[model samples]
Target: SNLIKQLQERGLVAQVTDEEALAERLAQGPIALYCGFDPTADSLHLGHLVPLLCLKRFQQAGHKPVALVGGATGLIGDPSFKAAERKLNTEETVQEWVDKIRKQVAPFLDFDCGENSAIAANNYDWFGNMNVLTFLRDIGKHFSVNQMINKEAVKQRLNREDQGISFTEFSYNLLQGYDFACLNKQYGVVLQIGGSDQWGNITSGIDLTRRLHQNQVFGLTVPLITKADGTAVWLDPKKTSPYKFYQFWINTADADVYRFLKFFTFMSIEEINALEEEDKNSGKAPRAQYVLAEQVTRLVHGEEGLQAAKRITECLFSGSLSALSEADFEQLAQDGVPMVEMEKGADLMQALVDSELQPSRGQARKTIASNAITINGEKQSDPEYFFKEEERLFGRFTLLRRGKKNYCLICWK
Candidate 1:
């Protein structure tokens, strides 16, 4: 399958060293292609979604997709952000983040596709045993520090006051470049797609792939997906909250929504045209924004989860607390997964207080009276709705939604 056409139409293609020749070779499916996820945090935020989705699109089109969890690279942060020095994540914490990211990356591509299986590789596999002497003798010789500093991300950090680059963070591009080199040798991966911020790092990988393996590697980078107001969107809705996620899309300007529509959704040209025709006032229609959010949300969260996300979103907006079950309530309510714990007799206010939910019962009642509270699919009209086991969503937990996107999980045993 020729992925270039779809990629081109979506406006997701960018900065290829040898565009025509690479496309000519790419259509033949030269074994596999890969993208890397650096576990910078414990969970992948919203920023990580697009590249993974692009991998899935390729897999669906019957090509191979490699999802790399940057276990090795995370030890030294990537300089793509163009900011200050980074605090290194411990190996134990890095592994935890790696696992969480693998789970996140698993949703888009079909792991059942025989030998390819949406392969997840960690650079820790290669770099764990290497010594500085050997690394500098082999990999470091290939990279020049002067050239690296010239990259935009590095230049900005170097020039800024009170913000000197760390050797640990500075060496990250080399490590990332090595990841592509490893994949090229093992799986014949030729392309690396990233945000425009990664152009420097991606180019480094391509250069190394050619010198080390005599292979002509490729890169594609779309522009960064930032809000018009200059705020960046978080990939993890948990951290960003669904309201913020919705607002991120809802606020897409007339100038940006069309590009976002193509970049984010699987909507066809005709379909996009129809949407554009309907939304005559640029971003006047929130429907296109909803489509962007839903496609991305469903891709990461799955269909049922997407439905649940939207259902919860609407429940909060429409103030339809009665539509949820206790189990559903519990999932939304807590940081921890919901568990049913028996309580002899706990009133709503006390229960909220005991669960570490409301800091004070006074605040709980105030929130309740203001139509900002609900439980087990029912609104708290009395402000004294007592906890009842039988009324639980699955007969085990109560659903609690505070306003539009705040969900708390409560279970009473």
Candidate 2:
């Protein structure tokens, strides 16, 4: 299969340096490519998946993938397409984040596939030891100040009178450019991939590599993944739990599910189109959503996490709490299921009102009397029923279900 064509078909390519040359290069044999992640945050979000996953796609196609964590660049934030200057983090904080991001991005690509195995790199290793004199004399001389000022990324910042770009951020392009030249020389990496916003930095690297190494390196930028509501879906389980992450995909709009599957999953275009056709023909539920959710959840979090998400989904749907484990409850809590923390001896009627499951204590009592609520999947009609330690799942949580769908968790304080 033509990798470039496949990527185009999947709508992954926003811009490429030269498609003809790149495709020719790809056709000749496996070529080494890279995508960098700056540790601006502790974890990579869903937005970073496009290029990160693109590296994995290249690896599967028998090309080497280099996942670069920007330990040095992170300390001096990239001000590309920013309205204001970014707050610089301490070296210690950036280093800690760099370590975390390194581990976070490791699962996507194979590292033991022999010749085409993935490589991990940190730019700080090279930049940390380099002297300022050598950097200015050799690297800085190649960059034209006039050309740098015209770049669309910094043009807006340069125009701003009140909060113009800082020298630290203004010089970020040179540092990143040096990273590419360094990578080209050290690891034989010839291609750089990133989000659309990285075009300026990517081109800078391409130019620098050409000037320094006299190598015609390539750059590819993938489209930015934007959410409808602008909420970030984080890769970290602690920041966004496996269950919530799974739900994020499961809740993808019907119109966008097929496209998302193409972007995020390894499923072939034929399979995705077939799924769409099947859904249209059968007039049944959109199975594509579940498939997308499952594939992505398993990819991000392992099979155990996927299973936990599925179990939680099924348990909630069936109003069955017995099948859920303590960890499952923890996932549910992290997933934002309405929770109320109180003493174990709290009255059910008052607890219901407190959890907002019932509007008032009188209504709570009436609802319980009518068997409209269940605690841990068992009917609890007694208004005066006090939650007991034995009734708590793992002696800490009680699943509260109102009627059929609404749920609240009661955690004993």
Candidate 3:
């Protein structure tokens, strides 16, 4: 199947303008496709992954992909699917975020491939020196307030009594439309892709491009992804570390597992169907989720990050502390494992209470007597155990485990 048909089979096509024309355009040869991401925060979250990946998918299919950083529009914040006006970020902060976004997105697309290299652009470059009069006279003239107000984002905000929309935010779609028009003129980009919520902004750009160039352009959007816990999976290592990201994919709900494998991973439809069938027959095995987690984590986080995620997983499941590197320990500490400083001769019982691994000394003793505790992955039946100088791994960190499951880290001060 062709790339467009494959995307359709995977259910990624949310809304594309002029599908027949787009198919024909794609068939002619490689064309430039771009997606805009606003620097709402310092890091791109997992929610931003789909469209970026869509650009990559097209690039792999021999098309040029452009990644646009919304340094200009990010100042106003796209109000699509947003109920309230956004807090405006300072130019310095937004610029810093733009750099961060560029760094984050660079690893996903090829910048040196022949004939179809990825292009990274910032909208601020074009909008920075432009006068307000020029913007209003040129780009603003193409959009009608009647049509703008009819957009779902604007209409929802207008209907709200508590939080009415601001002019700055109301003009975001116009700014995005201008971005598409600018890219269309400069790069001959005919397609824009984003999340389903971005359909309004995307189509607005398509219309603007058509008006400006008297030519055809397209819009395509993918569904937004939410975690099983009803939260977004962030892409930043600071927000959602590789370990947590891997877990997010591994914990895919049975209902959504196959769909996500189809969407997130590079696994072909046939392979995913085989996995689904095997999963349906063998309820005890979570083979599909595991593969999804591994493949997706390796893709996003690379081999080092994948290894760290696997080490964390091993520590959790097999209580294997040897596989973890110091970096892995630090990441685990930051990612929300119980980590505390230990004195030179802290006793096991006291350390347990101090680390909150046990409620009280008496309870700690009970758990110790039950032989349910392991220190540094070694079985420890004694509650009065004291840390020996040589027992600490890497000369500084010691691991404690309660039973076969719960684990904590003790760092020497």
- Give the best candidate by TM-score: 2
Cα lDDT for residue 232, candidate 3: 52
lDDT of 1 by residue, 1-413 (tens): 46677677777776656778777877655458788888887677656777777887777776688999988888888877756677777889988889988886776678897765678788999899889897887789999888988888688888866888887888888888888898999888888887778888888899999878999888887666755657545555565544445545665676678778787777776798788788886656446776777766665556765666676666656755666644335435433223335474677776666655578988888777777666744677567777666656565565566665455555555
| TM-score for all models, in order of appearance | 0.76, 0.93, 0.91
- Winner on lDDT between 1 and 3 is 3
lDDT per prediction? Answer: 0.72, 0.89, 0.85
Model 3 lDDT tens row, 309-330: 9888877677667787777777
**Sorted on lDDT, highest at the top, how do the candidates line up?**
2, 3, 1
Looking at candidate 3, the ten consecutive residues that score lowest on lDDT are 225-234
Ranking by TM-score: 2, 3, 1
Q: Model 3: C-alpha RMSD to truth?
A: 2.5
Instruction: Write one digit per residue (lDDT tens) for candidate 2, span 1-413.
Output: 78888999998999999899999999999899999999999999988988899999899999999999999999888988888998889999998999999999998889999899999999999889989999999999988999999999899887767879888999999999999999999888989999999999999899999888999999999988755555478999988889899988988987778879988999988998899999999967889999999999999999998998899888888777788988888987776488888787788898888889989988887899998898878889887787777888888888888888898998887
Top candidate by lDDT: 2
Off by over 4 Å in 1: 114-116, 228-255, 281-286, 317-320, 327-413
